[PDB]
Design a binder for these strands. Sequence first.
DNA 1: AGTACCTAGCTTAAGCCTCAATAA
RNA 2: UAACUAGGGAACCCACU
DNA 3: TTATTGAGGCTTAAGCAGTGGGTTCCAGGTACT
Lengths: 482, 138, 67, 115, 78, 1089
Amino acid sequence: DLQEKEVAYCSTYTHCEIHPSMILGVCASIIPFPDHNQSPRNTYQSAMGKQAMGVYITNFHVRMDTLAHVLYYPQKPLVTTRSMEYLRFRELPAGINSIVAIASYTGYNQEDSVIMNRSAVDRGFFRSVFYRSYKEQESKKQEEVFEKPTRETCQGMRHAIYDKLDDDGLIAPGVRVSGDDVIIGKTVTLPERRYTKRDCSTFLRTSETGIVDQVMVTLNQEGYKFCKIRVRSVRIPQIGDKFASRHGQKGTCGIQYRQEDMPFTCEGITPDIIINPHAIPSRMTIGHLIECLQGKVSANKGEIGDATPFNDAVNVQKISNLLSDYGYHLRGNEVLYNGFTGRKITSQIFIGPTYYQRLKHMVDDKIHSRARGPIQILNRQPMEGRSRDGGLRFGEMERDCQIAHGAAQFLRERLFEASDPYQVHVCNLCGIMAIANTRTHTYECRGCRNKTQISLVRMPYACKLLFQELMSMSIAPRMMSV
Amino acid sequence: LSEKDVDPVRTTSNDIVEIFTVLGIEAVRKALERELYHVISFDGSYVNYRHLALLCDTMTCRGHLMAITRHGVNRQDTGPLMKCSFEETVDVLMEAAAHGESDPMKGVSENIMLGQLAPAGTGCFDLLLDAEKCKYGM
Amino acid sequence: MIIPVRCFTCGKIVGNKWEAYLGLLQAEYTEGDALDALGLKRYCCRRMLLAHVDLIEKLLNYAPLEK
Amino acid sequence: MNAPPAFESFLLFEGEKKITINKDTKVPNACLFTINKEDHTLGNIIKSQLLKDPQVLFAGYKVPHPLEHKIIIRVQTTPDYSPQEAFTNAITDLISELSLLEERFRVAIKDKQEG
Amino acid sequence: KRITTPYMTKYERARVLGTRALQIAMCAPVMVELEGETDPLLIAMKELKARKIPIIIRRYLPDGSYEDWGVDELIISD
Amino acid sequence: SACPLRTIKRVQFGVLSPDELKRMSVTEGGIKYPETTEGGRPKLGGLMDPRQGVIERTGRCQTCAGNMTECPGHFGHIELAKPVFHVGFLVKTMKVLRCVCFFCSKLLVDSNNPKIKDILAKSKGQPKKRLTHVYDLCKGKNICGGCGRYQPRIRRSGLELYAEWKKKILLSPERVHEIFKRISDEECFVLGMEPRYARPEWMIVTVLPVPPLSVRPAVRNQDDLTHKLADIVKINNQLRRNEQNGAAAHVIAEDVKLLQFHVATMVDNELPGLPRAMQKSGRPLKSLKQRLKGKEGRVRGNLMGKRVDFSARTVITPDPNLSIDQVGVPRSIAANMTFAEIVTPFNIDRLQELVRRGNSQYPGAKYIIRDNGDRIDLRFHPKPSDLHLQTGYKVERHMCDGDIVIFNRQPTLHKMSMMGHRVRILPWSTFRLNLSVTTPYNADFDGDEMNLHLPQSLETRAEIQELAMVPRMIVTPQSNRPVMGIVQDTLTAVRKFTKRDVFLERGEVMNLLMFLSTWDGKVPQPAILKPRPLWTGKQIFSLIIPGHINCIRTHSTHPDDEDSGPYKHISPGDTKVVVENGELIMGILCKKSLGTSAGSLVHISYLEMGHDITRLFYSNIQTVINNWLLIEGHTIGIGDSIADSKTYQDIQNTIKKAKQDVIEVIEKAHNNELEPTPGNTLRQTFENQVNRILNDARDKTGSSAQKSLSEYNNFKSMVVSGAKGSKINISQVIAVVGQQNVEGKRIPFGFKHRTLPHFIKDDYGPESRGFVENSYLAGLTPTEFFFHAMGGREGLIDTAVKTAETGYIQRRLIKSMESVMVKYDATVRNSINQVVQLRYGEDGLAGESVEFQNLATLKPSNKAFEKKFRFDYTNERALRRTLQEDLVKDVLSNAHIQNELEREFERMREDREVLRVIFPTGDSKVVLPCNLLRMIWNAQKIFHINPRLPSDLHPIKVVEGVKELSKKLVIVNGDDPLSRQAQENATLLFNIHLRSTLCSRRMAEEFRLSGEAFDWLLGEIESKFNQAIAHPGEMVGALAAQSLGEPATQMVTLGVPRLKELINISKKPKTPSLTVFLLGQSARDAERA
DNA sequence: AGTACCTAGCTTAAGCCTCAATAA
RNA sequence: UAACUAGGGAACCCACU
DNA sequence: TTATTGAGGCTTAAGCAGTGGGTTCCAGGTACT
Ligand SMILES: [Mg+2]
Ligand SMILES: [Zn+2]
Ligand SMILES: [Zn+2]
Ligand SMILES: [Zn+2]
Ligand SMILES: [Zn+2]
């Protein structure tokens, strides 16, 4: 801008940018060619780069962090910005450069889904390890002690293999564990025969398995015995695991095909990931395609491509000519052959190396189901939480939709006997709930002097609690059977 | 509308309240229809006339303009329980207890509270056993 | 953390080529010439070596908890 | 968690049959060949070899679902022929073709090794 | 004289089929022959297509009165 | 349980009597001890009374000898030393005190008055406005046979009343209690309070009902409500001790104030301007009011909506190989959820081996339910003796293939976010869906989770199967069109599959026919037999198309002049879709023909063939098209985003010309040579000119980019299929991104008269104010990058506030009219049994079975209507060319036939006048049940009508058949004149359309139907009209609320704020306006205007 | 020492204040 | 000579559609 | 002339889409022996 030969639009410049790409933050500097993307996609990538898996810190072996994810084979991107040298993304990368074809193959990558190579995944592609740390203290108030519980002297022991614990009440590293397996044996003494101690052991999460990785035992601040147990879980990429590009193109894995089922180039290269062509045009992530082209050029050339945004030395035509110099089609298309029939595909598929990240959202940490489990103590409804074996909420909008269906019986069973079936004995003169002694068959309403005219009414427990709260507020919601 | 050379037939308003106070309840029903149709089909979308007509008829069935708030829905004779299912449950139940209001248990929300079959869809009738048709069985 | 045994895409052995790649790089080869000298012809095998980060050498700077 | 074991793509569990024969009812001389623990590798060669047979009026295969491991081959023949012997002849022709290809590849190995 | 619709509503279809399926699963005698059918849903379907379901639908009018319709008296949708 | 079981028919409300509270409470003598326990055991008379319920698990209650599960909890009471005000009744206490004499305790307005009688007549049967009217009349009254004492003015100060005469005194709740005690029974009648249920003296808290332990469960960890009860009984004991020993002066008043505060904060913690009831921990106490009011409270969070058993949730993934009514569920989910199957002799062996497999294997069972309700757990292995199954037992077997489930996605906006599916077991741990099912669910596969509900009863499963299956809800009642279309890959490939140049060899055809579920086994004759046997894609899709449906559609790239010029019936671009007899004659299919639009091929398939055949149609389209796409393929890359050099020169020339034009406008405004447009100042006219130039540049560059696209371009391939993207996206990628806007204007001067510090001050040019002149492929300059980031940020803000505002509108709309339904007399009524509509939609028809049709009589001129609709029984040779010989002789000879044809035309003319009254604008596109033109086309195709030949259909048979059919189509029953008028009004539009379409002249000339074809047409019209009538029991209010709130979530005040201002009756709308129309010369003269 | 125990913004309905016809 | 369950609340933060 | 009863302007609650996971916190203070 500082050239007097032109009109120059100004001649009183006081300052200059050091580089215009410096306006981006830490997460936005990871985006290659962010000036070729639509801005909401840059925002989405800035969000999801915080969810990528890599090596989060070098000393992760000594840290007993809760919820740690480590990728086995993180790679630095083939297509990088110059700010990644200062973000130290080269030394702690989060992702793998993957050969990716943008194609419609068998329809399992439709609508923001991807098709992964099963043979690649067998070779450690995007294989990660999940770490979860469990901590527990023993306290002196009632004394808690780390010890292996025994059925002859402990109360409340679950039906778990307590033999996995050692003599100190703690499990050892290298032991395989599953859900509801005791890892720390803790017994609290009863304040006042057959049982003298009460079981207060800690188990894993119900849907979580793994190997015990590290057990650390120390003193806490208040001078009590303190233990931390890290559980190692190896996570294979599977159907439903979330994968994202560096351009806001997230997507779960739809299916995994083996190498012989994947499409292949004339050189036998099969894609690691196949993404749908329809993910591109409404999103306008052209930086995705340019990064793919530059990755092809970089991998063939033997260098790392520069994708600093406001760089006029790099454009699509120069990358295309460089790719054409290496014996490929200049726009990155290749002739693919069908993996099932061997016939070459009529359309030539855009394929090349581009940088994906494995996001923290695995399906195995989200799959939840319940038949009948624990219920809340106030209302006798299913609890909240996958970790507490809770039930899903059939909310108000669900009730509205089931009303609009006309399905009165399904709505009734969901809101009555799939949540909290209950029954009360109510007087017939007053609508106040009566006293019911079921085994003596003496159902009486004190207040009405009513001994016989008592009706059993099947009503939800939450409605009974509501009516009892109303009578706590001096309201009489008299239930009349007539 | 009273001005010279102003058409008193076609001159209308966006304001629902003054159309109600000037032209009446059926005119404000039609105006509410037209305004809702405009705000729905401005973006080219289409909604069947049944739903717009039912919304306007529900909002204009009581002679006055019944706003879809706590100030129009919780002020009609809908019973304490379905009123408290919407909003101000404690205030509605306090008023019902103070006045001794009886809930006839005819709506869907009351039967949903009491866990009974809502008179809605499959619950709007009763099934009886035909004794004579059972004679031809095996 | 460490060089993969095989290329993810095709399965060519690349676990024996990381130390040779580093030796060629300190012998003032370019990265492309070093990849060509190791026989990595497909770009799928080339970015296994080009994009690899050896975190294991940083992990070895910490003393093991038992010895 | 729900991962199927890797051997279920090619190992018959105890109880099932490798190949079942089902007669197709809506057209004559047509049979459905449901083959378990196989995939496109075998269905494609059987389909193409049946397509080389002039007495075969229809030859197609499909995998109904890629998560399961069965193929269904549908063969319709001329009335003076049956889909069962069409399938048998297709397998026999594929076996003989592979035998000839194997022995000629061995001859080419000796020719290239001896120069 | 009955003034309600002579056609049998889909809500009536749903509840009649469910009630008849629950009865058949509770070993009610079937009004039609069975060609090896086992699921009480399909048995109730076959009973409904033959208009042999022994259920009277009591349609309640808004004024309080009711109208008793047999399943055989009503027009089946399919 | 010897008590009889039946439901609750009415709920009577009222205030609990102090005597009634005393005589049903199990705690005789009241609660006197604030401790929860004494000596390690619960204390009688304390808070945790064993008479009030079960203390801890495997225990008993002293009142009813039942354990914690079946003990409902038994109430106690606290006898107050001094009565206190009920804070929930304090406003009503204040209102009743003003209506009653302070001394007489009589009504302030005398009951023997015409005004009291008028109030009782107006408020006859309802208490609330009775009390309101009595309060209105008693306001300002000072003197009451009545006393001469002047009444005071009652004022609230927090929780305290002051009776001020105009001295003021402390209005103690004792004095209010004795005032309300001596109020007469008839005075309670006129005050809107039933003395049977609510005496005014019961509104003063003389005894406090302590709730049982079930209401306030102690985890040791006592409930905070128990802590408040402890405070209340502590203060009450302090009052008792001070009253019977101390008798202090003002300590008693302070203690009464503290007791009233504690009772009020037990009932309601959030008073206006009062200190919150806190603890030493530092948390406000949750009162009984706070337990109930919120969306997480009792009524909304635990009764209208609650967590349920037999539910599952995991990530969804695509599955093109599943049917649209199928869901692929994980094995671990299916091994967890159970369905209780009743043991019959028909399934005794299968259920026996399921029990023998147990819960460890997947296809097994979890429980056995015996006839006496005894539950046998199969997880912990029992003996073979109680594994025995007999008839009447229930086996809770694992969920298996073919099981019926509800599949749900939040947010649930309409009926089609909760649809019934058939369970298929698939290996991995995701739910799997057909791709056409995602559009009604608004789902994608980037991490979406969906909920699965398994119905547990057989009746509920049957009603889901008969009401809420996916095929049964292909067409919505919201907009009488399908909600499920053909989705991205399948749509893009079927556009490429049905082009004219698509040719398939024999092996490809036989491979594609393997994926037709409805194939009849016959390979069709190829479209080309020599030199090669070679089928087209249209033949294969014709095999896909079910039945004999007839549909005419139009491709997206269809020229507008093609339908008027030559080659209209032989399309050069193959852009007119014609389906005849269920086969595709020509035309390229897209979202206009296979999408969710009304009148599409899937819509015609649903309306003609039903739901099961249409489900098969969806599945067959997806499977065949995907397996052909395996051969053809579809991609997108850099080469689809580029243009040639000539197009780039055109784009650069257009951008340079636009920048020069903006510079010239800036120069004109700077030299004061720019004359302002009338109606706005110089700034607005300059902005209008600049925006006009930039919009013209954007349009020209977009057109230049669109003209450069080849047929092989994949952006164009996805756009013209309608699968993904638009022409704007192509223009932005290739030519120019365009102008970035914030709040409808250009990029504002956020700095001091600068958008950025890189520009000069007062720079109004394109690049300074947010015009991105580069494309996405070229790359944005840093200023353009920042301005585009501003625009995208505005979009994200709009999305977030849009969801947050539309949720409440949806909830208010559904709570307004949830109980509104069609009753069995075909009328529409609410829960109050009050009629809202006499017929649903004023015609009594359901919204899912009506179609867009055109009235042929509203629009044409008088001579055109006369020529087209009046039968010409004078032209003998024209009649012989249209009719057979005997019909021509009968029409010419018979004067009665000619008279009745003339009467038919006269009735059509009267119908035309009625139509032009109904539609003052000539808009003939109406929505009517039976698509008469398609039915006539179906009759032509079914009976092989030759249009070139004379017909054997007598026009008098047409007239009498239309009359008898109109007699048959009945919406309002009854032979009353009222019933006859309502019937004529309800079917007026459809009868006009029927007499217009099925007239004698049109059947003679245009349609040329035969006698049997006409009889079939009449029967089909009657059948499809009777199927269109709204079913009684339809929750039309809930359907209406969803149908109006669901477009809100995706959208001069307009959109969501205007919708909000219409749904509630806003006294001050944001943009109130009048649309003034002018009369006479002033409507045509601008000066008079 | 261990511990008993006694204590930011919106819109809108509802309630509450000063100035003008009108009979005393 | 298998003696069979789950546990609270209040606030905040983050993520997801 | 003058109170008297009617109708226009001020504060203050009551609202404000859903699903998981993690973290912290739910008590010191002198007496007294
Ligand atoms: Mg999504
Ligand atoms: Zn009683
Ligand atoms: Zn390789
Ligand atoms: Zn009890
Ligand atoms: Zn008095």
